[PDB]
Design a protein around this ligand. Structure first.
Ligand code: SAH
Ligand code: NA
Lengths: 265, 265
């Protein structure tokens, strides 16, 4: 009669909360989805071993089209866990799955976990200063999205920071790098010419948030666009005006140039 | 010899990540602060038992004034952990403490935990649609802070949602309820008269996120300002322009007036 949406956290199998792990172990069935995001620092095998029970992975189609035929039927008569990377209901459309559970007469509870939305706090940027967020998607065929560019412009105009999720092809486990995102942004700038993203734009890159050794780098585009930030996932942030404390953190912890203390503050 | 900033999560001792618990268990000294937020589902004793370590609780002044005098010295010759509610770098000024650590020759690491900043996803609102955030501060004496009202105004003009952290005076055990925040805002509305927050404004309240049965409610201020949402902590949200799917969830899960389904376009 109960369905638990459990977050797996940011990077590896230990990023799940103790609450999530203990509940998952008590469930009769454990499902998981790895298409809304990825756990780059672990494998299905390691997660399965930590929990101690076999996990059935579900495709996007399984969930979006048949959640009520695969998961809900079991949740009606048993305790079922639905594992997802990050925080459940964040950076996904899983919220509506709770409505489906309600209509199926199934109770649902949410076990939270760290999300990149909060983890970016490790960049030293004040969380309250972040504005609207966006995703930098890979251009493909006749679709070349550029909406993210307007998001940055509107946030920066108000001195707010912009969190940019970088595209990911979950199935293939292929991640867009900060470098590629910077390349695309420069191309959108070349077309829109709004003076929003250029070689002199200060950006922050967060790679592998969650690991004990994430890469946290800050600097001007012309300098970071060709830098190696290590393995995925990569997150790109375009800061607005900086508080002196944010800037010093960037300099001290993220190797940002001293110039930002007089240019971006 | 290192310093670990470890988040404990939203509600109880099990909201810590497995990564954080195992690391904390192996630290020589463990410090903590419980003034940046309220964990309503556990006790210091229960946390100590989980980690198997005696915890030295520090006051705001201990941290802001003497962190480098109380914690860092020990971190030079021992593995030290500093625990905080939720995520240590969200809606706190602890990030700055990493700068102190570095200049003290102490390497530091961060272990994330579920944060209210992303847990609000349980309200069904699109997390990417949130704009600048603000804190509703308690007035003190004749000093009446109101800058948070302007934050809502700015986001609303952009159609963005506004996350309102509510004040907390730990030492005085003062935890601002959503009701109190609504009262303060209505008073600020009468002063500035900007049509930003009124009896007819739609708001969302999230109480005790992290618990299995948090309070999730949505409705007009006039109707909710007198409602009992249970014990603190509480977080208040003023949605901007709603998407149909957000409205659907608020109605289905947060018991919002079915009339919001008919969104304005
Ligand atoms: N479990 C919870 N439920 C509802 N609101 C919460 C909450 N935890 C924190 N808050 C909100 O956030 C305020 C603390 S601000 C510090 C937040 C913390 N670092 C985090 O990551 O969550 C509280 O006064 C309250 O308004
Ligand atoms: Na945000």
């Amino acid at each position: 009669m109960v369905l638990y949406f459990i977050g797996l956290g940011l990077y590896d199998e230990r990023d799940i909360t103790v609450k999530g792990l203990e509940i998952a172990k008590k469930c009769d069935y454990v499902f998981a989805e790895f298409y809304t995001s990825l756990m780059a620092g672990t494998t299905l095998g390691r997660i399965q071993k930590l929990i101690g029970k076999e996990i059935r992975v579900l495709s996007r189609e399984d969930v979006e089209l048949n959640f009520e035929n695969i998961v809900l039927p079991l949740a009606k008569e048993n305790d079922v866990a639905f594992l997802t990377p990050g925080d459940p209901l964040v950076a996904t459309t899983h919220a509506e799955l709770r409505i489906r559970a309600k209509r199926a007469g199934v109770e649902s509870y949410v076990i939270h976990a760290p999300s990149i939305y909060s983890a970016v706090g490790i960049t030293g940027l004040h969380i309250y200063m972040f504005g609207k967020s966006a995703t930098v998607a890979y251009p493909e065929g006749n679709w070349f999205p550029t909406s993210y560019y307007d998001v940055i412009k509107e946030n920066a105009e108000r001195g707010l920071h912009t969190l940019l999720f970088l595209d990911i092809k979950a199935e293939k486990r292929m991640y867009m790098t900060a470098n590629e995102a910077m390349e695309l942004l420069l191309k959108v700038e070349d077309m829109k010419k709004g003076g929003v993203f250029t070689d002199d734009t200060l950006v922050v890159v967060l790679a592998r948030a969650g690991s004990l050794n994430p890469t946290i780098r800050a600097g001007y585009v012309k300098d970071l666009i060709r830098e190696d930030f290590g393995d995925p996932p990569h997150i790109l942030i375009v800061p607005g005006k900086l508080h002196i404390v944010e800037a010093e953190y960037l300099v001290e912890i993220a190797g940002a140039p001293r110039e930002i203390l007089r240019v971006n503050v």
